[PDB]
C-alpha cells in the first residue's frame, strides 16, 4: 500500500470508464438498449420515441461522466500544482517551511 | 452508426461539442500538469562518470546504465508496483523523458546544489 | 399396467448441506478471466437439500412440488435412475412431460399420460419391465436424443421452466465418496432447451427395480429448490466457471 | 479547422476537428446465409445479432454450448459461426479522432493530419504511437516542442516536420 | 417502499451506485481532512502541573 | 407517471451530488490550507508574510 495514491487515481478513472460503458446496456425505459433492434423492430413514428429515450439516458450518463472527470481533473490539477511547488522548493532549494 | 439517431441528436444542439471541448481541456491540462511538475529546467545536467561524492552513494536514485529504460532502481520498482467512441490519448511526455527530467534534476541538485535552480 | 409396491420400510427423508453445488451457466456467452453478476433462479449456498435413498428396504419415489426450479443431485452407480415426470395433475386431464433413458435410447415426450400411482422401471437378472403410464392420448411433442447418463458417478441436473422454455442443465462428475455429497465446485453446462409451453407444478423421478419379489439398487438423490438471487461468477482464462459467490448468503460474500 | 474554430484565421497548434469512422464495406449474414469474409470491416449478422466489425480468426477455445463472447464491459467481442463450427473475434471498426496540425494562417496554409490510434496501413505518411500522421516529414533531428503531437512526438514548421 | 418504482428504476442502470460512491468518497474525504489538519503529532504532550 | 417522478427525483439527486462534490473540493482546499497553517505557524515559526 505504499503507492496507494496513484493506484486510487488509476482505479477511479478505470471504474468511471467501465461504468460509462455499462450505461450503454441500460434501456432507460425503452423496449431495448440496442438501437439496431429498435430500427429493425419498429416503424419510425415509435422508433423516434425509443431513440429519444435512449438518447436522453445516454446523454445524462455522458454528462455525469464528464462532470465527474472535471471534478477529478480539478483535484489532480491542485495536486500537480502542489507537486510543482514541492519540486521548486524542496528539490531546487532548501525550504524553511515546517513539514 | 445509426443515422436516424444522429439526426435526432442534432435536435438537442451543441451538447456533444461541449462534452468534447471539456474532455479536450482535461486532456491538455494533464500534459500541462506534467510539464509544470517535471520540466522545471531547460538544461539536461549529467553526473560525472566518477561517483566521488565524499562517501555519499546515489546509485539507488541515479539512472541504471544496464537497464534499457534508463531508470533508477527506485523508479523501476515504482513502475513495477503500479498495475464505442472511447479513445485513450497518449501523454506528451513518455516515461523515458520524465525519467530523463528527473535525472537532470538529480544531476543538478547533486553537482550544483541549489544554484542551477536560480541561474547557471 | 400398474403395480403397488407394498414391501417398503417407513423412514423419514433426510436433509443435508448443498455446499457450493447447484451452479450453472446463466447464458450461452463465453467469458474469459472476468467476474459477472447475474440475477437468475439459483440454488443458495449451504442450503438444506432433501436427501432420498434407494437401498435394501428403502424405495423412495415421492411426488414433489416443482416450485420455481429444481436442482437434482444423483450419487449413482449401475444406472438406477432413468428419467423424470413433470406436470400439474399427472393424469390425462392436463398435459405432462416425460423424460426417459431406457437401455437403448433417450426419449422426450409431451403427452397426456395416465400415470401410475407407483411408476417404475425394471431390470431382470436385462431390462424387461416398463410401468410408467397406462395410456397416452394427445401427444404434442416428441424428441429423441443422445444418451444423457460405493457410488461412482455424480449426476447434477437443474430444471427451469421460464417463458414456456424448459431448460435442462447437466454435469457429470467422477466421484469416489461413499455416502453424502462431495464438497467442491462444478458448473452445470446447459444440456437441453426444450420448447414445451406448458404448466409444471409437480414432478416425480423414475427408479428401476431389480428382479430375482423386487430389489432396489443402491442409489441416492437430492432435491433442492431454486430462488431468484444474484451470483457473482468467476471465469478463468479458459472460459470455465471455477468459483461463484452467493451475494445473499453471508456479509463477506455480500 | 476553420469551420471547427469558427474563424477564418487559425493560430499555430493542433486542433481536433473530426472523427475517421471507417465505413463498412460489405454485409455478411450467417445462419445455421451468404459467404463469410475476414479481415474487413463489414456489417455482420450472426443468428440475429447484428453489428459492424472486422471478423478475424480467434484463439479462444469455446465450450460446445457457448455461442457469443463478451469482454469486461459486456460488449460482444467473440462469436461462433453457425455454418462452420469456428470461433471469430470481432474487432471494432477503426475509429479515432482527426486532428489538424497547422502553423498560423499568416505564416502558411500547409496542414498535417493526425489520425489518433489508427494504423497507417489501413487509412509523407509516418506511424507514431499517438496515431498515423500524414503530411509531415519525419526527421531524425531533435528540436524543442513547437506543436505537441503526443508520445514524445512534436511538429514544427521550417514544410511541416515531425 | 414501492416495488414497481424500484423495478422501473432498475432500467436506468447504475446511477444509484455512482451517487452512493460519490457520497462515500466525500464522507471519507472529510475524515481524511480532519486527520490531516489535527493529527500531525503521534505523542500526546501534557503541560506541567 | 412513475417514470416522470423517477427522472425528476434522479435529476434532483444528481444535482445535489454535483454541488456536494464541488463544495467537497472547496472544503478540501480549505482543509489543505489549514493543515499547511498548522504545520508552518504552530509547529514552527514562519517567515512567510501574512
Ligand atoms: C553504492 O551502493 C551500491 C548499492 O547500494 C553498491 O553496490 C553494491 O556493491 C556490492 C559490492 O560490490 C554488491 O555486492 C552489491 O550487490 C551492490 N548492490 C547493487 C544494488 O548493485 C555500491 O558498491 C556502492 N558504492 C559505490 C561507490 O557505488
Ligand atoms: C396403487 O395404490 C394407489 C393408491 O391406493 C391406487 O390408486 C387408487 O386407485 C383407485 C382406483 O380404483 C382410486 O379409486 C383411488 O382413489 C386411488 N387412490 C389414490 C390415493 O388416488 C392404485 O390404483 C393402485 N394400483 C393398482 C394397480 O391398483
Ligand atoms: C433441514 O430441514 C429439516 C426439517 O425440514 C430440519 O430438521 C433440519 O435441521 C434442517 N437442516 C438445516 C441444516 O437447517
Ligand atoms: C398452473 O398450475 C397451478 C396448479 O396446478 C395453478 O394454480 C396455476 O394457476 C396454473 N397456472 C396457469 C398459468 O395455468
Ligand atoms: C426404449 O423406449 C423406446 C420408446 O418407446 C422404444 O422404442 C425402445 O424399444 C425402448 N427400448 C427397449 C429396450 O425396450
Ligand atoms: C385429448 O384427448 C381426448 C381423449 O383422447 C379427446 O377427447 C380430446 O379432444 C383431446 N384434446 C386435444 C386438444 O387433442
Ligand atoms: C487453461 O488451459 C491450459 C491449456 O490450454 C492449461 O495449461 C491451464 O492450466 C488451464 N487453466 C486452468 C485454470 O485450468
Curated annotation (Swiss-Prot), chain A:
Result of changing residue 40 to A: In strain: Alpha/B.1.1.7
Task performed by this protein: Subunit of the fusion protein that is processed upon entry into the host cell. Mediates fusion of the virion and cellular membranes by functioning as a class I viral fusion protein. Contains a viral fusion peptide that is unmasked after S2 cleavage. This cleavage can occur at the cell membrane by host TMPRSS2 or during endocytosis by host CSTL. In either case, this triggers an extensive and irreversible conformational change that leads to fusion of the viral envelope with the cellular cytoplasmic membrane, releasing viral genomic RNA into the host cell cytoplasm.
Upper lineage: Viruses, Riboviria, Orthornavirae, Pisuviricota, Pisoniviricetes
Coiled coil: 7-51
Gene name of the record: S
Shown chain mapped onto the complete sequence: 943 to 1041 of 1273
Consequence of changing residue 39 to F: In strain: Omicron/BA.1
The name this protein goes by in its record: Spike protein S2'
From Swiss-Prot, chain B:
Impact when changing residue 52 to Y: In strain: 19B/501Y, Omicron/BA.1, Omicron/BA.2, Omicron/BA.2.12.1, Omicron/BA.2.75, Omicron/BA.4, Omicron/BA.5, Omicron/BQ.1.1, Omicron/XBB.1.5, Omicron/EG.5.1
Site (Cleavage): 71-72
Protein name: Spike protein S2
Function: Precursor of the fusion protein processed in the biosynthesis of the S protein and the formation of virus particle. Mediates fusion of the virion and cellular membranes by functioning as a class I viral fusion protein. Contains two viral fusion peptides that are unmasked after cleavage. The S2/S2' cleavage occurs during virus entry at the cell membrane by host TMPRSS2 or during endocytosis by host CSTL.
Carbohydrate-modified residues: 57
Superkingdom of origin: Viruses
Swiss-Prot record, chain C:
Consequence recorded when altering residue 155 to K: Partial loss of biliverdin affinity
Disordered, as annotated region: 122-137
Effect of residue 13 to S: In strain: Gamma/P.1
UniProt-annotated stretches for the region Putative superantigen: 236-254
Mutagenesis / variant outcome for changing residue 5 to F: In strain: Beta/B.1.351, Gamma/P.1, 19B/501Y
Record-annotated disulphide pairs: 2-116, 111-139
Glycosylated position list: 4, 48, 102, 138, 199, 238
Effect of residue 101 to Q: Partial loss of biliverdin affinity
Outcome of mutating residue 75 to I: In strain: Iota/B.1.526, Mu/B.1.621, B.1.1.318, Omicron/BA.1
Effect of residue 63 to A: In strain: Omicron/XBB.1.5, Omicron/EG.5.1
Mutagenesis or variant effect for residue 118 to Y: In strain: Gamma/P.1
Impact after mutating residue 178 to G: In strain: Omicron/BA.2, Omicron/BA.2.12.1, Omicron/BA.2.75, Omicron/BA.4, Omicron/BA.5, Omicron/BQ.1.1
UniProt domain BetaCoV S1-NTD: residue ranges: 1-254
Quaternary assembly: Binds to host ACE2. RBD also interacts with the N-linked glycan on 'Asn-90' of ACE2. Cleavage of S generates a polybasic C-terminal sequence on S1 that binds to host Neuropilin-1 (NRP1) and Neuropilin-2 (NRP2) receptors. Interacts with host integrin alpha-5/beta-1 (ITGA5:ITGB1) and with ACE2 in complex with integrin alpha-5/beta-1 (ITGA5:ITGB1). May interact via cytoplasmic c-terminus with M protein. May interact (via N-terminus) with host bilirubin and biliverdin, thereby preventing antibody binding to the SARS-CoV-2 spike NTD via an allosteric mechanism.
Name of the protein this chain belongs to: Spike protein S1
Source species: Severe acute respiratory syndrome coronavirus 2
Lineage: Viruses, Riboviria, Orthornavirae, Pisuviricota, Pisoniviricetes
UniProtKB/Swiss-Prot annotation, chain D:
Effect of residue 136 to V: In strain: 19B/501Y
Location of the region described as Disordered in the Swiss-Prot/TrEMBL record: 21-32
Glycosylation sites: 25, 27, 106, 119, 140
Impact noted for substituting residue 116 to H: In strain: A23.1
Annotated S-S bridges: 41-93, 120-132, 145-154
Quaternary state and interactors: Binds to host ACE2. RBD also interacts with the N-linked glycan on 'Asn-90' of ACE2. Cleavage of S generates a polybasic C-terminal sequence on S1 that binds to host Neuropilin-1 (NRP1) and Neuropilin-2 (NRP2) receptors. Interacts with host integrin alpha-5/beta-1 (ITGA5:ITGB1) and with ACE2 in complex with integrin alpha-5/beta-1 (ITGA5:ITGB1). May interact via cytoplasmic c-terminus with M protein. May interact (via N-terminus) with host bilirubin and biliverdin, thereby preventing antibody binding to the SARS-CoV-2 spike NTD via an allosteric mechanism.
Function: Attaches the virion to the cell membrane by interacting with host receptor, initiating the infection. The major receptor is host ACE2. When S2/S2' has been cleaved, binding to the receptor triggers direct fusion at the cell membrane. When S2/S2' has not been cleaved, binding to the receptor results in internalization of the virus by endocytosis using host TFRC and GRM2 and leading to fusion of the virion membrane with the host endosomal membrane. Alternatively, may use NRP1/NRP2 and integrin as entry receptors.
Name of the featured protein: Spike protein S1
Species in which this protein is naturally found: Severe acute respiratory syndrome coronavirus 2 (2019-nCoV)
Gene this chain is encoded by: S
Amino acid at each position: 500500500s505504499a503507492l496507494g495514491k496513484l493506484q486510487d487515481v488509476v482505479n477511479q478513472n478505470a471504474q468511471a470508464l467501465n461504468t460509462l460503458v455499462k450505461q450503454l446496456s441500460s434501456n432507460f425505459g425503452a423496449i431495448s438498449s440496442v438501437l439496431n433492434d429498435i430500427l429493425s423492430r419498429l416503424d419510425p413514428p415509435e422508433a423516434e420515441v425509443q431513440i429519444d429515450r435512449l438518447i436522453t439516458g445516454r446523454l445524462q450518463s455522458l454528462q455525469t461522466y464528464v462532470t465527474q472527470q472535471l471534478i477529478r481533473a480539478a483535484e489532480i490539477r491542485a495536486s500537480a500544482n502542489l507537486a510543482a511547488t514541492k519540486m521548486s522548493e524542496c528539490v531546487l532549494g532548501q525550504s524553511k517551511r515546517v513539514d | 452508426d445509426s443515422t436516424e439517431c444522429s439526426n435526432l441528436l442534432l435536435q438537442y444542439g451543441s451538447f456533444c461539442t461541449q462534452l468534447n471541448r471539456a474532455l479536450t481541456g482535461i486532456a491538455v491540462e494533464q500534459d500541462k500538469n506534467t510539464q509544470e511538475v517535471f520540466a522545471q529546467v531547460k538544461q539536461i545536467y549529467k553526473t560525472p562518470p566518477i561517483k566521488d561524492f565524499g562517501g555519499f552513494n546515489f546509485s539507488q536514485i541515479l539512472p541504471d546504465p544496464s537497464k534499457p529504460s534508463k531508470r533508477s532502481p527506485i523508479e523501476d520498482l515504482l513502475f513495477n508496483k503500479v498495475t464505442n467512441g472511447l479513445t485513450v490519448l497518449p501523454p506528451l511526455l513518455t516515461d523515458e523523458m520524465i525519467a530523463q527530467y528527473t535525472s537532470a534534476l538529480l544531476a543538478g541538485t547533486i553537482t550544483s546544489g541549489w544554484t542551477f535552480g536560480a541561474g547557471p | 399396467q400398474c403395480v403397488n409396491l407394498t414391501t417398503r420400510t417407513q423412514l423419514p427423508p433426510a436433509y443435508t448441506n448443498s455446499f457450493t453445488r447447484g451452479v450453472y451457466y446463466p447464458d450461452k456467452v463465453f467469458r474469459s478471466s472476468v467476474l459477472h453478476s447475474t440475477q437468475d433462479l439459483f440454488l443458495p449456498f449451504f442450503s438444506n437439500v432433501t436427501w432420498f435413498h434407494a437401498i435394501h428396504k428403502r424405495f423412495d419415489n415421492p411426488v414433489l412440488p416443482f416450485n420455481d426450479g429444481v436442482y437434482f443431485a444423483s450419487t449413482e452407480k449401475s444406472n438406477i435412475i432413468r428419467g423424470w415426470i413433470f406436470g400439474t395433475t399427472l393424469d390425462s386431464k392436463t398435459q405432462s412431460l416425460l423424460i426417459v433413458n431406457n437401455a437403448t435410447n433417450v426419449v422426450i415426450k409431451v403427452c397426456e399420460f395416465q400415470f401410475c400411482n407407483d411408476p417404475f422401471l425394471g431390470v431382470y437378472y436385462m431390462e424387461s419391465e416398463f410401468r410408467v403410464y397406462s395410456s397416452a392420448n394427445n401427444c404434442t411433442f416428441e424428441y429423441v436424443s443422445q444418451p444423457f447418463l460405493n457410488f461412482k458417478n455424480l449426476r447434477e441436473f437443474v430444471f427451469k421452466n421460464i417463458d414456456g422454455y424448459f431448460k435442462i442443465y447437466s454435469k457429470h462428475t467422477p466421484i469416489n465418496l461413499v455416502r453424502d455429497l462431495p464438497q467442491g465446485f462444478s458448473a452445470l453446462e446447459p444440456l437441453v432447451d426444450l420448447p414445451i409451453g406448458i404448466n409444471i407444478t409437480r414432478f416425480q423421478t423414475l427408479l428401476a427395480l431389480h428382479r430375482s419379489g423386487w430389489t432396489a439398487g443402491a442409489a441416492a438423490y437430492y432435491v433442492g429448490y431454486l430462488q431468484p438471487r444474484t451470483f457473482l461468477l468467476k471465469y478463468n482464462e479458459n472460459g470455465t466457471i471455477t468459483d461463484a459467490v452467493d451475494c445473499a448468503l453471508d456479509p463477506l460474500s455480500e | 479547422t476553420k469551420c471547427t474554430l469558427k474563424s477564418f484565421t487559425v493560430e499555430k497548434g493542433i486542433y481536433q476537428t473530426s472523427n475517421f469512422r471507417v465505413q463498412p464495406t460489405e454485409s455478411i449474414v450467417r445462419f445455421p446465409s451468404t459467404n463469410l469474409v475476414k479481415n474487413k470491416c463489414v456489417n455482420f449478422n450472426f443468428n440475429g445479432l447484428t453489428g459492424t466489425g472486422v471478423l478475424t480468426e480467434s484463439n479462444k477455445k469455446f465450450l460446445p454450448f457457448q455461442q457469443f463472447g463478451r469482454d469486461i464491459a459486456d460488449t460482444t467481442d467473440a462469436v461462433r459461426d453457425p455454418q462452420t463450427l469456428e470461433i471469430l473475434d470481432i474487432t471494432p471498426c477503426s475509429f479515432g479522432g482527426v486532428s489538424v496540425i497547422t502553423p498560423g494562417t499568416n505564416t502558411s496554409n500547409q496542414v498535417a493530419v493526425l489520425y489518433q490510434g489508427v494504423n497507417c496501413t489501413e487509412v509523407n505518411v509516418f506511424q507514431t504511437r499517438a496515431g498515423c500522421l500524414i503530411g509531415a516529414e519525419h526527421v531524425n533531428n531533435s528540436y524543442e516542442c513547437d506543436i505537441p503531437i503526443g508520445a514524445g512526438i512534436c511538429a514544427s514548421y521550417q514544410s511541416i516536420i515531425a
